[PDB]
């Protein structure tokens, strides 16, 4: 029969047994809370500053022994988002966050709900930037583990405990469509206990798995580099007396490999250690290097063959140097695809096992 | 006969039946509102963080049963934009927004208008960044659907309903001139009902259609790549004994295709899956690959023809290998334009149908 | 004989006939104001988000019927920039602005001056980002019109009118030195009347003209492309039997044109429609395309000439095919500079007239 | 014997002859101030938005006729940085600044010190972005003058005067290490008098000199371009009958000059007028253009020599065309280094004098 | 038996001997503090604006002679992070910081703890951007020293002293994974005394060592440039009469060196002085320059050999010019690897000693 605004200001009023900066059931057992996270948006995964940015709906539920009506018909009251300083809220902060802020749309995006027995539901909508460290030892086949973890600030484990929800603790809205990665539905929820000098502190931690697509990285920087290795292998099927043809093919294949590598370096992320891409670019450059050194090793012999033709022993080394040159051009014609196939097997095997392993440790 | 500032402070005064944080006609039917959106500016459509940014004029109109004069000549009162906290405003927020803010020009860009019967008009001017997910499976021919949707924050469907306006709900100022897309005058306005555990929540949603121009993407990265495929086809019209001419044309056409592809990768947007552009760059590289492998398959036969001329059966395989080489150079001279025309037909058909389909589902 | 701070607080005091949120000479004729704009800095003209950023000194002058002394020696009073909320200020906002803010140097950059009769001078210093739409159909020869316009927010034309100053309304400080454009001293000042459902609203609008220099765009991407067209024309002066010389010149000229075009695409602004630069790059690529197709049309005839020399009628088509080839090499030697000169005349004429036209409409 | 906080609030108390918004010795001579600037950090010199950013320690010293103790042992009092609004401070602002802000570390970075006679020392620590216009007509050899100037806001020259300090007015902390320029120890301090309609306003102006290093710009884009001009000059020492050798050297030298120029354009700053770098790139491209046109002028004569050998007068023009060709190849072999050395002398002289001149005007 | 909030407001109450803006044990010995720094995150090391960004946990511990209970069971009290203005805090600021801010997660990230005797523990969590100057004279082998230092603001050394902690003053959380550098566990902690005109000011300074990995910089821009120098050395093993083969190898090796250098310039950081990378790119370009000038010096002699064969003295200079050419091709075949090996030894020695030296000075 009375408006609730004229009642909610008398529970936490001046003449009432309520202090705003005090724990519920003080000098007693610790008051635990139940958390829930609803991600609206996800992305801007940047490797230079090593972070990402989210929009979450953090919802907390805790019990409080006072603030009970037991004589009113309305079972749920709502507190005004201006005077949030009147109620007690548990000190929560994100451990690995860079920057965070509230939302400033036409209403203050806050919500407080007090039930009959004294249960409090507190749901906000915030956006924030979480730091995550990334390792790119195997870049176009990597998986990434991006975690979050939320602490207390000055309250011990015997004073305030955090708890994940039992059913649907972390929910993700449908249709996110990351530009680089693919998020997985693992969502494993763990615990940490911050052991300090003062005492143990509570922690809970969510953990997302991201897998990188290699579709674009296959069509571009892999198929052209493979095709130009096969194009460098064309010089094993051309006769030796056509000297500027095989030289012009060899050096231009090296030029094609360099402009293929250096033309793509602006698109790749920038780190100071080796990746999986530049090992492939190094071996692909070393093959077009070796297909020209094989030609220089052949042409030196055929040139000093012609120098001895200018000078049966005079012409026995003629047919000896011809059979020597053709046996080099045959054993290179057979050997050069085979060691590259052996390297490509050992490459794709040593990368599939390592990426598979990086998923099992979580 | 009295100034309105000395009257408007007595409607929502202390000794008056008004509470600021209470619903109109409380414990009754839900108070619906009528919304209107006027876009001033539109752009900064970024794909990396998957959002865009607007400047809107959000105008709301709702009825309120109290706050009526019925005895004053002025039919329209104006409230001061400083003390907006005195009146009740419906809690509205954008569901898929990243960040939002008001405008801070010489006056506070707010407006409140109270009519005779109690109708309230509330018009603000805000700027904000809406998240939209983009799919670029067919990049230079794509259409994009960019939506917005606006919710309540804590009020149920039986407590607060949203409604689009009947005539001219969403208006767009003239002369916007996006740098990438072209906006269409569809402006289809739909509804959503957020079904949660607590209850149904109201929603209305605007929906814009953007179509990407392919004028620049046709002149650049399509016409040069086609012309250099025709330039690679010149090597089917040159005689076989000119070996370094056709080799120097073939490898330099491959070099031209690689520097055409890798030179343009900084201008394209960055994703990890395949697009429509690099399928064309893959087939265009595979054609200049195959026009050199056809030459290596011809020159191997003409070289072992000359090797048997160094060694009628001795010269029957001479004319056999010549007719074999010329029949390969003829069937490649006829086949290579035809399968490329068949591929270009199947390409433009499989992209026109998919883009047309992406418009019908809206 | 008294300090003015102890007098200025009694004009707009509590017991005085002053209301802060009321119009001067209420229920009467509209109070007009006189505006003045002094630009300190100008630049950051960005095409991606389609805006620019200024630093202005907005100065307003209006009359007010009260607030007159008529008994004090000091003719000019100064109000403190903290308590600006005591006086009435006209609601002004920029219609096409993205974001705006004040200045927060050691003093609040505000100024209020009240004369004897009641004239008020109000001069602030603000910085703000105005949206402007740009059209780049003719990119390196374009002119741009960048306007600003300032409105009222909720006051009708019969309630508040805006007026430009008579002498020196818009002033520009000397030595601005834009990095891209050149500002002109046109400064044409117009009016708008915002016709809405509620009524007519006042507007005044400044309008700046910017002209883009083409000095860098002439030395780079025009002179090299022209010179390599003349370099492709060298292949009309070399004999036909030197086959790998003219082929190696032709394909490398095509390679030079592609690396000239794609090497410059990162420096150009990014739009989705055609510009004036890539039409020149398309015709310059089509010329080095046609100088190689002319060589393939010549070499096909001289090759089947040699094929008939392998096979007077046997040698009548010998001299017929030689006179046919030399007549093609002569008519291409004369035709290829002439149609390019005709195209370059029609190009520079169709661009000079369009740019000249874009200046006259203002 | 009393705490100073209980005394400093009674000098500027309510019942005391102090007004906060009033000039010292009102209706009298103007109160001058003494300024000092200590730069902590310097950099982010950006040419696109034409500004730079500093961190200064602005310190002011002025006299005030009241606020004297003459009966206390402590000669220096300190005011709390929260209630800075109690004291009078002179209105100072930077004329050519884009944006400015205070510092928000654990304490408010403010300082107030009141001596015995009434001298006030006011020292803050602020960071701010000053606009400077840059002219890049001679880019890799330019000097830049970057000034700052600080005004009053509404106080006339007969009301408030600014003054530089006598010894050490502008100090610079050691070890700044700009990434592009080198700062010089000139630090010339001048005056301005802002003549307006209202009256003269005071100004003082600091002025820094920055000199750009050309060490990187010499090793890269100068030495390779010079070396490839000498590489194009190799074609004057090769015999004429080796046609595809000299053609393949000539066009590839042109290709090397284009990929040297266009490969470096992303590193250069972006303006619309000419610089010193692209004049060198234009003349270096015109030399490799002229070394190929000299070859086409030679090969046309030697080809029509061979055409007349196909047709003593028949063979008198044989030796005439041979002596004509060798005299062209000799006079080009001697002329081409000499006019390039004359151009390189006139180039380095016309740039050294202009850069030297740009230092003397300051 | 009483709640601590009703006691903590009476220690620093109005009727109590506490002033907030006064030093503990005033007119006495200086109150020293003990500091501690815990870095959570580290990175965004940018060279253009010459700074980096951290997230620290600054913890201070000082004694205060008042504020003692000596009659309560709870030994540790906690102050509310809203009313931090009631207590005295020492004025601390970072000397070389660009910008700083607090954290605005659901609770104010502050902590105050008052022990029995009067010891105060004050622990905050802040993020801030420290300026550091970098020198890149030896870029891919450099070490960097990045310091921080924290001052007082207006308090003398005889009024406030800073002190590092004895055990674990600066701690670093595990698993940081910088994208460019590698942090070392040196953490040397020094002192500074700011000698000014007013007096000595206290300072303590932390100092981090960062070492740059050269793994990526070895695979890319070093191995390809070395391999193409060995590819340019192939032209010393090809006979002289194959003129367009060795010319086409030489100029294309120069083209490969230029597109290798200019293709990588976008990935390197931008400075105006020389580095270690472009000295290697200059010598690697000068080697492929000299391997073509050696060929022009050989081919000039063999061409004028053929010119004298067109004209025993007539043929004595034939064998003289042949033995002269082969002795040049032999002494270049032996000399060109040796002086490059001597240069590569003097290069790696002069860079290892300088980098080693830059570690010892700290
Ligand atoms: C004897 C050498 C004299 C010294 C050369 C020198 O300092 O530069 C003079 C000219 C500059 O020509 P300019 O400047 O070319 C720019 C074209 N514009 C004005 C329409 C934008 O340099 C040139 O001539 C190159 C300009 C190429 C043609 C335009
Ligand atoms: C049989 C094939 C075995 C599989 C090959 C494979 O997985 O990579 C092994 C090596 C990696 O050499 P690593 O790593 O080279 C980096 C040089 N460092 C350590 C000083 C920075 O791969 C290489 O050998 C390429 C490294 C080039 C020489 C350095
Ligand atoms: C949750 O909070 C409760 C107190 O509200 C913690 O204390 C438990 O209280 C129950 C009920 O009296 C006892 O049965 C348990 O023995 C108490 N716990 C301990 C450790 O003594 C409780 O620990 C908190 N955590 C959980 C997971 O329930
Ligand atoms: C709009 O608000 C009204 C109440 O102001 C809602 O209730 C309707 O009230 C009318 C008038 O009494 C009745 O005729 C309807 O039956 C009521 N609606 C229902 C669902 O019972 C109304 O629902 C709201 N919405 C619309 C679209 O009118
Ligand atoms: C400027 O404001 C005046 C009122 O202060 C407007 O009204 C004019 O008042 C004058 C003086 O009485 C009359 O002569 C005019 O007829 C009034 N105008 C109209 C339209 O009736 C005036 O309109 C405003 N504008 C201008 C340009 O003066
Ligand atoms: C500095 O301020 C003084 C007043 O405090 C200005 O006035 C001068 O006062 C002295 C002392 O009475 C006279 O000798 C001068 O003649 C006054 N100046 C003038 C222009 O009349 C003074 O002008 C200010 N400036 C300087 C540089 O001293
Ligand atoms: C730390 O603060 C103390 C005062 O609290 C400083 O003064 C010292 O006080 C002790 C105890 O009375 C004396 O033994 C010393 O002689 C005092 N120091 C001096 C310089 O006179 C003390 O200097 C501060 N610093 C350190 C390092 O202790």
Coordinates of N, CA and C in Angstrom, one line a residue, chain A residues 114-223:
Chain A
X114 N 16.6 -7.2 -4.9 CA 16.6 -7.8 -3.6 C 15.3 -8.6 -3.4
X115 N 15.5 -9.9 -3.1 CA 14.4 -10.8 -2.9 C 13.9 -10.8 -1.5
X116 N 13.0 -11.7 -1.2 CA 12.3 -11.7 0.1 C 13.3 -12.1 1.3
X117 N 14.1 -13.2 1.1 CA 14.9 -13.7 2.1 C 16.2 -12.8 2.3
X118 N 16.5 -12.0 1.3 CA 17.7 -11.2 1.4 C 18.8 -11.5 0.3
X119 N 18.4 -12.3 -0.7 CA 19.3 -12.6 -1.8 C 19.4 -11.3 -2.7
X120 N 20.6 -11.0 -3.2 CA 20.9 -9.8 -4.0 C 21.4 -10.3 -5.3
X121 N 20.8 -9.8 -6.4 CA 21.2 -10.0 -7.8 C 21.7 -8.6 -8.3
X122 N 22.9 -8.6 -8.8 CA 23.6 -7.4 -9.2 C 24.2 -7.7 -10.6
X123 N 23.6 -7.0 -11.7 CA 23.9 -7.3 -13.0 C 24.3 -6.0 -13.7
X124 N 25.5 -5.9 -14.2 CA 26.0 -4.8 -15.0 C 26.4 -5.2 -16.4
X125 N 26.7 -4.2 -17.2 CA 27.1 -4.4 -18.6 C 28.4 -3.5 -18.8
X126 N 29.5 -4.2 -19.0 CA 30.8 -3.4 -19.0 C 31.6 -3.9 -20.2
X127 N 32.5 -3.0 -20.6 CA 33.5 -3.4 -21.7 C 34.9 -3.2 -21.2
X128 N 35.8 -4.1 -21.6 CA 37.1 -4.2 -21.1 C 38.1 -4.9 -21.9
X129 N 39.4 -4.7 -21.7 CA 40.5 -5.2 -22.5 C 41.3 -6.1 -21.7
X130 N 41.3 -7.4 -22.0 CA 42.1 -8.4 -21.2 C 43.4 -8.6 -21.9
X131 N 44.5 -8.6 -21.2 CA 45.8 -9.0 -21.7 C 45.9 -10.5 -21.8
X132 N 46.4 -11.0 -22.9 CA 46.7 -12.4 -23.1 C 48.1 -12.5 -23.8
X133 N 49.0 -13.4 -23.4 CA 50.2 -13.6 -24.1 C 50.1 -14.6 -25.1
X134 N 50.6 -14.4 -26.3 CA 50.5 -15.3 -27.5 C 51.9 -15.8 -27.9
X135 N 52.0 -17.0 -28.3 CA 53.3 -17.6 -28.7 C 53.1 -18.1 -30.2
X136 N 53.9 -17.6 -31.0 CA 53.7 -17.8 -32.5 C 54.9 -18.6 -33.1
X137 N 55.4 -19.6 -32.4 CA 56.4 -20.5 -32.9 C 56.0 -21.2 -34.1
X138 N 54.7 -21.6 -34.2 CA 54.1 -22.3 -35.4 C 52.9 -21.4 -35.8
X139 N 53.2 -20.4 -36.6 CA 52.2 -19.3 -36.8 C 50.9 -19.7 -37.5
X140 N 51.0 -20.2 -38.8 CA 49.7 -20.5 -39.5 C 49.0 -21.7 -39.1
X141 N 49.5 -22.5 -38.1 CA 48.8 -23.7 -37.6 C 48.6 -23.6 -36.1
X142 N 48.6 -22.4 -35.5 CA 48.6 -22.3 -34.0 C 47.2 -22.4 -33.4
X143 N 47.1 -22.9 -32.2 CA 46.0 -22.7 -31.4 C 46.4 -21.7 -30.2
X144 N 45.4 -21.0 -29.8 CA 45.6 -20.0 -28.7 C 44.7 -20.2 -27.6
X145 N 45.2 -20.1 -26.3 CA 44.4 -20.2 -25.1 C 44.3 -18.8 -24.5
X146 N 43.1 -18.2 -24.5 CA 42.9 -16.9 -23.9 C 42.1 -17.0 -22.7
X147 N 42.6 -16.6 -21.5 CA 41.9 -16.8 -20.3 C 41.5 -15.5 -19.7
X148 N 40.6 -15.6 -18.7 CA 40.3 -14.5 -17.9 C 40.2 -15.0 -16.4
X149 N 40.4 -14.1 -15.5 CA 40.4 -14.5 -14.1 C 40.0 -13.3 -13.2
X150 N 39.2 -13.5 -12.2 CA 38.7 -12.4 -11.5 C 38.9 -12.6 -10.0
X151 N 39.4 -11.6 -9.3 CA 39.9 -11.6 -8.0 C 39.1 -10.8 -7.1
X152 N 39.4 -10.8 -5.8 CA 39.0 -9.9 -4.8 C 40.2 -8.9 -4.6
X153 N 39.9 -7.7 -4.0 CA 40.9 -6.7 -3.7 C 40.9 -6.3 -2.2
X154 N 41.7 -7.1 -1.5 CA 41.8 -6.9 -0.1 C 41.1 -7.8 0.9
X155 N 40.2 -8.7 0.4 CA 39.5 -9.6 1.2 C 40.1 -11.0 1.1
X156 N 40.3 -11.7 2.2 CA 40.9 -13.0 2.3 C 39.9 -14.1 1.9
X157 N 40.5 -15.3 1.8 CA 39.6 -16.5 1.5 C 38.7 -16.8 2.6
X158 N 39.1 -16.6 3.8 CA 38.2 -16.7 5.0 C 37.3 -15.6 5.2
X159 N 37.2 -14.6 4.3 CA 36.3 -13.5 4.3 C 35.4 -13.3 3.1
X160 N 35.8 -13.8 2.0 CA 35.0 -13.7 0.7 C 35.5 -14.7 -0.3
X161 N 34.6 -15.6 -0.7 CA 34.8 -16.7 -1.6 C 34.1 -16.4 -2.9
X162 N 34.7 -16.8 -4.1 CA 34.0 -16.7 -5.4 C 33.6 -18.1 -5.8
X163 N 32.6 -18.2 -6.6 CA 32.0 -19.5 -7.0 C 31.4 -19.3 -8.4
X164 N 31.8 -20.3 -9.3 CA 31.1 -20.3 -10.6 C 29.7 -20.8 -10.4
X165 N 28.8 -20.5 -11.4 CA 27.5 -21.0 -11.4 C 27.4 -22.5 -11.8
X166 N 26.4 -23.2 -11.4 CA 26.3 -24.6 -11.7 C 25.8 -24.9 -13.1
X167 N 24.9 -24.2 -13.6 CA 24.3 -24.5 -15.0 C 24.4 -23.2 -15.8
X168 N 25.2 -23.2 -16.8 CA 25.3 -22.0 -17.7 C 26.0 -20.9 -17.1
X169 N 27.3 -21.1 -16.6 CA 28.0 -20.0 -16.0 C 28.5 -19.0 -17.0
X170 N 29.1 -19.5 -18.1 CA 29.6 -18.6 -19.2 C 28.8 -18.9 -20.5
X171 N 28.1 -17.9 -21.0 CA 27.3 -18.0 -22.2 C 27.8 -17.1 -23.2
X172 N 27.6 -17.5 -24.5 CA 28.1 -16.7 -25.7 C 27.0 -16.5 -26.6
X173 N 26.7 -15.3 -27.0 CA 25.7 -14.9 -27.9 C 26.0 -15.4 -29.3
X174 N 25.0 -15.7 -30.1 CA 25.2 -16.4 -31.4 C 25.6 -15.5 -32.5
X175 N 26.5 -16.0 -33.4 CA 26.9 -15.2 -34.6 C 27.9 -14.2 -34.3
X176 N 29.1 -14.6 -33.9 CA 30.2 -13.6 -33.6 C 31.1 -13.3 -34.7
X177 N 31.5 -14.3 -35.5 CA 32.2 -14.2 -36.7 C 33.5 -13.4 -36.6
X178 N 34.5 -14.0 -35.9 CA 35.8 -13.4 -35.8 C 36.5 -13.3 -37.1
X179 N 37.3 -12.2 -37.3 CA 37.9 -12.1 -38.6 C 39.1 -13.0 -38.8
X180 N 39.8 -13.5 -37.8 CA 41.0 -14.3 -37.8 C 40.8 -15.7 -37.3
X181 N 40.3 -15.8 -36.1 CA 40.2 -17.1 -35.4 C 38.8 -17.7 -35.5
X182 N 38.7 -18.9 -34.9 CA 37.4 -19.5 -34.7 C 37.4 -20.0 -33.2
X183 N 36.3 -19.5 -32.5 CA 36.2 -19.8 -31.1 C 35.5 -21.2 -31.0
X184 N 35.9 -21.9 -29.9 CA 35.4 -23.2 -29.7 C 34.6 -23.3 -28.4
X185 N 33.7 -24.2 -28.3 CA 32.8 -24.4 -27.2 C 33.3 -25.3 -26.1
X186 N 34.6 -25.0 -25.7 CA 35.1 -25.7 -24.5 C 34.7 -25.1 -23.2
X187 N 35.1 -23.8 -23.0 CA 34.7 -23.0 -21.9 C 35.0 -23.7 -20.5
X188 N 36.2 -24.2 -20.4 CA 36.6 -24.8 -19.1 C 36.8 -23.8 -18.0
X189 N 36.2 -24.0 -16.9 CA 36.2 -23.1 -15.8 C 37.0 -23.6 -14.6
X190 N 38.0 -22.9 -14.2 CA 38.9 -23.4 -13.2 C 39.0 -22.5 -12.0
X191 N 39.8 -22.8 -11.0 CA 40.0 -22.0 -9.8 C 41.5 -21.6 -9.6
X192 N 41.7 -20.5 -9.0 CA 43.0 -20.2 -8.5 C 42.9 -19.7 -7.1
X193 N 44.0 -19.9 -6.3 CA 44.1 -19.4 -4.9 C 45.4 -18.6 -4.9
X194 N 45.3 -17.3 -4.8 CA 46.4 -16.3 -4.8 C 47.1 -16.4 -3.4
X195 N 48.1 -17.1 -3.3 CA 48.9 -17.3 -2.1 C 49.8 -16.1 -2.0
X196 N 49.6 -15.2 -1.0 CA 50.5 -14.1 -0.7 C 51.0 -14.1 0.7
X197 N 51.7 -13.1 1.1 CA 52.2 -13.0 2.5 C 51.0 -12.8 3.4
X198 N 50.0 -12.1 3.0 CA 48.9 -11.7 3.9 C 47.9 -12.9 4.1
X199 N 47.7 -13.7 3.0 CA 46.8 -14.9 3.1 C 46.4 -15.3 1.7
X200 N 45.6 -16.3 1.7 CA 45.0 -16.8 0.5 C 43.9 -15.9 -0.1
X201 N 43.9 -15.7 -1.4 CA 42.8 -14.9 -2.0 C 42.1 -15.8 -3.0
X202 N 40.8 -15.6 -3.2 CA 40.0 -16.4 -4.1 C 40.1 -16.0 -5.5
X203 N 39.9 -17.0 -6.4 CA 39.9 -16.7 -7.8 C 39.1 -17.8 -8.6
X204 N 38.5 -17.3 -9.6 CA 37.9 -18.2 -10.6 C 38.3 -17.7 -12.0
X205 N 38.5 -18.6 -12.9 CA 39.1 -18.3 -14.2 C 38.4 -19.0 -15.3
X206 N 37.9 -18.3 -16.3 CA 37.4 -18.8 -17.6 C 38.6 -19.0 -18.6
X207 N 38.3 -19.8 -19.6 CA 39.4 -20.2 -20.5 C 38.8 -20.5 -21.9
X208 N 39.1 -19.7 -22.9 CA 38.6 -19.9 -24.2 C 39.7 -20.4 -25.1
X209 N 39.3 -21.2 -26.1 CA 40.2 -21.8 -27.1 C 39.9 -21.2 -28.4
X210 N 40.9 -20.7 -29.1 CA 40.8 -20.1 -30.4 C 41.7 -20.9 -31.4
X211 N 41.1 -21.2 -32.6 CA 41.9 -21.9 -33.6 C 41.9 -21.1 -34.8
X212 N 43.1 -21.0 -35.4 CA 43.3 -20.1 -36.6 C 43.1 -20.8 -37.9
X213 N 42.3 -20.3 -38.8 CA 42.1 -20.8 -40.1 C 43.4 -20.6 -40.9
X214 N 43.7 -21.6 -41.7 CA 44.8 -21.6 -42.7 C 44.3 -21.6 -44.1
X215 N 43.0 -21.2 -44.4 CA 42.5 -21.2 -45.7 C 43.2 -20.2 -46.6
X216 N 43.2 -19.0 -46.2 CA 43.9 -17.9 -46.9 C 45.4 -18.1 -47.0
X217 N 46.0 -18.6 -45.9 CA 47.4 -18.9 -45.8 C 47.9 -20.0 -46.7
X218 N 46.9 -20.8 -47.2 CA 47.2 -22.0 -48.1 C 47.2 -21.5 -49.5
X219 N 46.1 -20.8 -49.9 CA 46.0 -20.3 -51.3 C 47.1 -19.3 -51.6
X220 N 47.4 -18.4 -50.6 CA 48.5 -17.4 -50.8 C 49.6 -17.7 -49.8
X221 N 50.8 -17.7 -50.4 CA 52.2 -17.9 -49.8 C 52.6 -19.4 -49.7
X222 N 51.7 -20.3 -50.1 CA 52.1 -21.7 -50.1 C 52.0 -22.3 -51.5
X223 N 50.8 -22.2 -52.1 CA 50.6 -22.7 -53.5 C 51.5 -22.0 -54.5

